[PDB]
Amino acid sequence: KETAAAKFERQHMDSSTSAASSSNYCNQMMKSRNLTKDRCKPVNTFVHESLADVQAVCSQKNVACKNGQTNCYQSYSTMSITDCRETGSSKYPNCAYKTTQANKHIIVACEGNPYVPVHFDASV
Template identity: 30%
Template structure:
């Protein structure tokens, strides 16, 4: 049985119609994660830089109490969802290695802008939620328990 080119094209287009909304949904959650937590380079970054960054990325209405930026490549962060991460608690992944991070902590009385942040730099393992191989959530509450755990041996 030979399929006509028109029928093959129809099957291909129908496949795209079904697949694209799913890919777009996954992509939007990953993009939100990157907006909130990805900052490639850590050098020269101070309180003012992060106050501006938090505002530019629309994380200040209301002022977000704590936000952590991860300084590495997108591919290295994504790899925690696979070979470079280990299961953690029920549905999270913990990085097998430490990452450079900057944690911005809101200081001041009001939760309304202008928001003031203090940036503290460090290196630690990170805990994320993954969906279909992409990071979609950084679990900042797990950091305290992560700091005291040894790195996995590779």
């Protein structure tokens, strides 16, 4: 099995690169992180910051989650991220994505003890 915390790291953490990306960043990352196995995951964001910095967001600005829950948090500082959006011509299993880089405040949902990220909600 895989914990929600571990899944968040697999799906949304990529500290190995500051700005990372290459036009093919997402095409390679969505596949390597196994996000295209059961289907082409439509949208997924990778954060280029230390695990500590991202985990710390759980003690930052409390904001409402898109699903109505109250356990979401927004980072006070902007973070380097890469949004991966499935193209319109993408056809499983050959999932194709558009690699977009940006510097925004991330919003994640946190749960557990330790209180850590378990869902990436949005960026603003």
